[PDB]
Subunit: 401 residues, 4 copies
């Protein structure tokens, strides 16, 4: 309330600090949206974002590390520059995504994800910078995570230990409605290659193998759990009709709400692929993807605290697929709310690219960044909340084996 | 020629003896045709045929053994009753078939097969009975072989040793044209049963197994040798749609021109059946038929001698499927000529039953019986022919491993 | 409260009247459970239930009509016998089901459905019988509806106009948990018959038609809405392998949450069935079931009033498939709550038959009957509720076209 | 015999003229074999062959027309230069093929086909050049026909009228054995394209269409005539698994021994392709090849005359697929004998390329060219043969509708 240094007053400061930075935050979104770049090729977005945190006044007050582990990834850190000597500081992480989609551009609104992560972290710092009483030990960490749509850049960062010292991690994703949580499933990719032998009696038909595998999985759909998903293509199904195909290649991905269910679904698919080899006489290589994507672990305490802030900002509550943030949420407590940006268009369509770059989307983006920053302030000043986040994180970890 | 006791004169005697017996031979065909009986159920035909050889004058001059090994099989033997004491007699076999088809009756003309086997043997005896100079040691053996269309009664007789002491075996089969030999293939029967487990996620779908097996074999047809044949049905594909089928059953038969090719074809089918089990998660029982049918081994010497007789009778030369005579032809040299009976109807159709019982078919049946009997006389009096039959039989046996 | 003739006091009377009748209501359930009868064959259950309402004291105070429209259906009615002359009486319906399942008996607990419908109606009458002040014009109607698991006896009753004068209809169904509503989908049954022509070149393969139809639907599953369901069997897939099958027969049922979605799903299946005919060369008969089952329309006012009563009885809130009550709920406002009976066994399994007939299930059955009866009392004495039920019923009817 | 100007003496002259030209004919084969060129790209072979006939002494005695209708086709003509004025001259055609195979080179021995056509025509001219008595009116015509393995260059030449004035046409093809005729079937090519629409419920799956078409044809194989052939590939079966494929493409070719059978086979395939569209909901384009290849019409008189010559040369008598010579044989009487070249390797394999260019193949090639040339001499001097060829050609034309 009207009290010296209230949490409600710090929350107001962070919202004022975000409104003051609206112009240059909009420029940041425009720079990434206008130059769409694909996974691991986000060189321009990496330059724009590293320069953004280097130029925040005072110069070099954000400690920026470009090319952090990945060439297009980065890391920016800020803390109050004073020590006292008590005693573990709180580490709060904010993620920026910035990879686009082939052909249609930023049809997932990833330019706004970079903006919202930068804005939230800016707002937190400004609320803590305007504090007389020595501020609690906090480090604001920003991580640029490339290649969300393909590869999974967060996973490469996890393998470098980038998340081992974070206590909470925040990010947000533009969608069609406002929701503090939405079920993103685990995912496993696979590439299947069949090899036979090229009169047609003396023939092993690798095209038959591909078709029989397709038939095997198709009838299996009747026994799939209703939450499971299986999609795939025949990449190579022959070259010339006068030669019996001695090579075929399929590309599939499977999805399930948990890792244990995903392993069961993957094993039944493996049987379907191996059966086609047995029936055709071909040999088969089944090569899984480099990284499995994890389902997103929810955190009741963090989500309930986030919704209470958004309701004050005026957000009314009620996705794209699977994200490498699920791997993050398995090692650091986090939230990944989806927000609406003034459009009815669907994600990963051409009309969403229009909305993602529109002037009208800027209001909704900064508003949700305000909600993230206030939620970070809650964790900083409510120790009962921090233990609540850690309790919910520990319990959900056991239920996922 | 016009020489005392010429082979040409004995051949004429056998034709006269067959013409004299035309009336009662026609009655024999009529008795079997008018009362069609199925495999192993030919009780009436067994009575008619045993009574036929018992009534041939003088009474009991044919040594008849009813219920020989099988209830509806029989054996009849005749030899010149005088001994001399020299020295191995020649054993000449003639087979009678007499089983019909379900519903359509004697649509394969099996009544005429019984007639032609009885007639040939009658003609041989009459040619040798009217001989003054002590006749060469010969035993005429007639074997009633039931269950040709299903089961294979000749094979049951082979297992009892019925063919171990025969030197040559004769029979003939009514068809659409006249041919001393026609390619009957080997055959292997199989019954495939799938077992699963009965919400549908917790389900093993045995109907999927049947359909996937069908798909597996269907695409395999492109790589089958053009002489191979595969036919099958889904006998049991479920009972009620609201229960996931936990049981399915297929019935298939495979055909190939040789036993070595048939084993290769059977092994690829086995892979197709097992792949469906792997893809569906079901277990599978693959039960082969009680008896595999063999392809018919030709005998150049016997066939060339048969065609030379038929040409004298006026027969001009150029099938149903697979016959257990192929198993016989692997242990005794034999011939299985097909003959035309005055009709364009196809075997195993309703209109062939009409032809098989017609008066017009009697002329062609007795004519081909005349050709068989003269061919038997050739073997009896041409030792160079007998060794030629045995040489060709020995060589063909090696080529079939 | 402690007021002369309170609704809370009438609700207590109905619970006392149900407890007093527990012994003979248990006997009623035992009589149906011990003699399981199938659809349209429930002659013994029809006798037991008609005799039950005829014996309720005073004799013939329930007006019983046996063999109502169907041979095993019945109708029982009671009202206060006094007229006043004001003015439309309220008609309250209670349904009794009593058909079992082949082999496993009453694995859906339908004996308890008959009991709960009889008990609810008994409790309502006893609450209104013990009233001095002239009671509001009410008619309690009980309808025996045979053949729920097959055929749909309620639909036959709808076609006779049995529901045209009911204002509200009640029934309850034993399951695994307590829920005032659970989503039962619409359903459409179909029987598909393929006709071809019986050498195999001159052949139309009706078995191919069945298998191709199966393949057509199987790959379609990937594009089915996740709430849709398709299940089917190959009833007839051939008779003998040596005859090319000229006839095949499939039996399928489809489910969708609305009639509009069900028509779309049925049309795509029709394309899959017709494509198999085109590909094989066969003709096809597609024969839909005699009666389509409708999805169950919820009624917010009735369900919220029912849950408020159950909470007082001690019921804690949170199915089998599709029911012909959905057709009823489209013409009369109704509720179809599911209740737990002391077991973890699943419906339509052998172990549920054990629970359905157990002594332990009697407490839960009478308890839910108490909840239904009190809910009926709410409708009788709260005119604001009756209009609320009619408003919600009218609006839901428009959303379903 | 030893008679002035005997046909046997002219036949000897043609064999001597071919032996004298062995060195430069071998060089011709070597020039084409060492520089393999594909269909319609045979620029170097066109230069070599046109220069060959231009250099035959006396210069320009062969009237050479380069770039005849096609850029790599050619035409060379020779006749005795003297007129007499009687009266229609005999036109005798010899074809040269010279296109190779992708990757493996001249694995069909087409370099030897060019050689044998040049050699036969050289031998005919030399036999007629060494004649005093005015020679009968004959024109020797050589036609370079490119693109046999793809496209069908003879068909392009037929459409230009190149064959309308030929009386007999000769060519020969290296294989594994010596045969005056071998059954080459008719062929029809087709390209099938499926178009759908890209959540997956709102999806038309063009990949399903391709797979269902494959299933439709696969089960049809059981009812195909045993002489029919169907082969095909899935050229395009998707691009990325996360997008439902809205486009697929198949490439198939069908073969049958006659055009009437080929139309029936093509119509059943058309049904299979259209059924997949109906089942999937996609639209379909079925585009047949630019040119259908015809089966080769035999000519008993020409073949019997050819075998009588080859037997004198020492050839003992007893393929690759389908050839555009079948279209030629439908408008001009011709023969297309296959000859052995000293190898057991199969056509269109890497080891056949070795044999085709070997020194050992030259003897067999020149020998068969001798047989062709003597057969041409038979037609020139036996008018009874010419009418016999024309009678057999006319009758076979009616049997093919
Ligand atoms: Zn995305
Ligand atoms: Zn995204
Ligand atoms: Zn038969
Ligand atoms: Zn037969
Ligand atoms: Zn039920
Ligand atoms: Zn039920
Ligand atoms: Zn070739
Ligand atoms: Zn070629």
């Amino acid at each position: 309330l009207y009290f010296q240094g209230s949490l409600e007053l710090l929350k107001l400061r962070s919202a004022e600090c975000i409104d003051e930075a609206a112009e240059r935050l909009g420029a940041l979104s425009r720079a990434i949206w206008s130059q769409p770049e694909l996974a691991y090729e986000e060189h321009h977005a990496h330059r724009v974002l590293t320069h953004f945190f280097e130029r925040e006044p005072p110069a070099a007050s954000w400690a920026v590390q470009p090319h952090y582990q990945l060439p297009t990834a980065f890391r920016a850190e800020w803390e109050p520059p004073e020590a006292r000597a008590p005693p573990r500081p709180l580490h709060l992480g904010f993620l920026c995504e910035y990879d686009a989609l082939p052909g249609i551009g930023h049809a997932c609104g990833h330019n706004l994800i970079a903006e919202v992560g930068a804005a939230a972290a800016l707002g937190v710092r400004g609320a803590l910078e305007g504090l007389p009483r020595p501020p609690p030990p906090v480090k604001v960490v920003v991580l640029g995570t490339p290649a969300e749509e393909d590869g999974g850049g967060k996973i490469d960062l996890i393998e470098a230990g980038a998340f081992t010292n974070l206590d909470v991690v925040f990010m947000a994703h533009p969608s069609q409605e406002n929701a503090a949580y939405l079920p993103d499933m685990a995912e496993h990719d696979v590439t299947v290659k069949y090899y036979g032998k090229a009169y047609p009696w003396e023939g092993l038909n690798a095209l038959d193998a591909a078709v029989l595998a397709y038939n095997n999985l198709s009838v299996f759909r009747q026994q799939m759990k209703p939450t499971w998903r299986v999609h795939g293509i025949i990449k190579n199904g022959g070259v010339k009709p006068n030669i019996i195909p001695s090579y075929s290649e399929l590309i599939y991905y499977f999805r399930a709400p948990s890792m244990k269910e995903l392993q069961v679904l993957t094993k039944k698919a493996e049987d379907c692929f191996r059966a086609a080899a047995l029936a055709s006489g071909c040999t088969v290589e089944i090569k899984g993807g480099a990284h499995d994507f994890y389902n997103v672990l929810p955190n009741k305490s963090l989500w309930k605290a986030y919704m209470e802030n958004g309701r004050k900002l005026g957000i009314e509550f009620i996705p794209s697929g699977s994200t490498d943030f699920g791997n993050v949420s398995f090692v650091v407590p986090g939230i990944h709310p989806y927000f609406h940006i003034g459009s009815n268009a669907l994600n990963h369509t051409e009309q969403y690219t229009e909305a993602a770059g529109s002037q009208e989307a800027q209001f909704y983006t900064l508003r949700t960044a305000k909600a993230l920053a206030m939620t970070a302030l809650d964790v900083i000043f409510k120790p009962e909340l921090l233990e609540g986040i850690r309790e919910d994180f520990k319990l959900k970890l056991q239920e996922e084996q």
